[PDB]
Amino acid sequence: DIRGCPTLETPLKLTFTEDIQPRKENYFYYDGWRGVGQTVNPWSPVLDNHKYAATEHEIHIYVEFFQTPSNRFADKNGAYSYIDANGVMYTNGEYSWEHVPALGKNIYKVVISDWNKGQTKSIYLPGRDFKTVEVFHFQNNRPQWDDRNSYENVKSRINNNISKSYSKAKLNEQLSTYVHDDGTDSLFLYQKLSRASLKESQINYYQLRGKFNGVNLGYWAQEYILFGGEGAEQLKNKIPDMSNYSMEDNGSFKNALKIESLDLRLMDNNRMAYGSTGTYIASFNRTDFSMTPENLKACGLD
Amino acid sequence: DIRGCPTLETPLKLTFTEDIQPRKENYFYYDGWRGVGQTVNPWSPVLDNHKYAATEHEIHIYVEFFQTPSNRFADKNGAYSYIDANGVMYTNGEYSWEHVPALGKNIYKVVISDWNKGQTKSIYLPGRDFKTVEVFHFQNNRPQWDDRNSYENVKSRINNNISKSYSKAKLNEQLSTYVHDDGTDSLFLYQKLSRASLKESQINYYQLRGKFNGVNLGYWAQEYILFGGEGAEQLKNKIPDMSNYSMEDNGSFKNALKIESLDLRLMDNNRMAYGSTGTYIASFNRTDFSMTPENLKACGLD
Predict the structure, then answer these.
(1) Which domain holds residue A191?
(2) Which of A92, A174, B81, B188 has its CA 20 to 30 A from that of A287?
């Protein structure tokens, strides 16, 4: 018996942070979140920006457990939840979970909305002993937006339609002004956390990065989320020159009990193709509980 | 093995809330926290108020454990703490604990300051398995204020000097204007939580209520914290007519694991002695985690 270690009962947080600083090009400022603007402080959009740019962003989280969620009590602000006899989940504070039995037994859904400039969105998972967590990141003013609640249609686009890779030749193309739409999905990011087993000591993650709303000024600005995953923030103000750019991230967090939170940060990066194509980073990192070497060792987390 | 119940590892919160609404008397408004004012919205003090009234309030908490605090990790915002080899406690966020070995082994101190109108102060205890928690509530512009860090002198006043009871005849006395000071202590409230045993399932509490700064306008307004303890809020706008008024509160919270937070609220009550003496309530209540009857029973907390 060793007391005081983090356990599967200890809550795990998910954070989502908007951190896109607008990029000057000569002239106007590009910003994947709100389009293109003529001035920066304060923000002032180009003439026809409203036709193209997003004004709303949403995070939909689907959690699947191996069994009924095990926690037996709820707190004031939502760090702890429980389910009743019928499988309805009770959570207090800003967020509540919808039981979605149609998708499967032990699956729950939350929608975080009003995600604006500079904001960090935070939510506790109703259990650390999950099987799967899927996150959909949706942006406004795109044709799939009205249909964002269809889990199946979104998954279909993820599996069958969204590019897993972009060539350098593609990133260097100029879409002609005369094309009216650029084809970018409302879905701009998909995250999947998975654990192979109930008492499993690691968390696997996957991401499928997409694009932010394109804006057609007198040409076409297209906005690719070109890099992501752990430590991707260290690549800010760098675009390595290679022939293909992967839109997928893959990795594993060992010693997951040591993790306080899994953090997504969306940030700006250099522009390519003379300002015609923007690049962005979707970094996904862990912040750990602070622990001494001797407590790490004692809790088997070194 | 039953999973999902609240344990001694689950953090326990302490809350402190200022909720004194000023009372009109004909005319000016009395407010135990900031004195006497000529107008209310916004606040505007009487001529000589600064001579008498508090402008600062502080909460000093001393926690004693049965053994070294058992938690082995620290989080971002301070819900969890740990100690190192030398007994220094590590906590992140707004508050940190000072190790005070001079007072005893396993004793820690925190000072919460800047406690202003309407504010709730919240802090997690570094352990639920404590032996003792003592709270000192200090107010400004009183002669014991400079000495508020002397644990021993404060305890001496608590044991030897602060009245445990006030008579009705006393509450109905008018101190003459010609007396310059009313004698009220900087210490206006003392709380003691105690547990008789490491794995003990209840929390005992005690309070010694005092007075808020008196103000001498053309007479003497004196400010007694006349009621307190659990459910004392239900006595708002009531002063029961009896011959003595106890300044002590005593009670017990059974099933302490069910408690999310122990809540102190300071509130105004009717004035006595034709407005010369104010009364206030220091209610001390539990807010529980929400739990179904069937989870209460399963966790042995019904």
Answers:
(1) 1-302
(2) A92
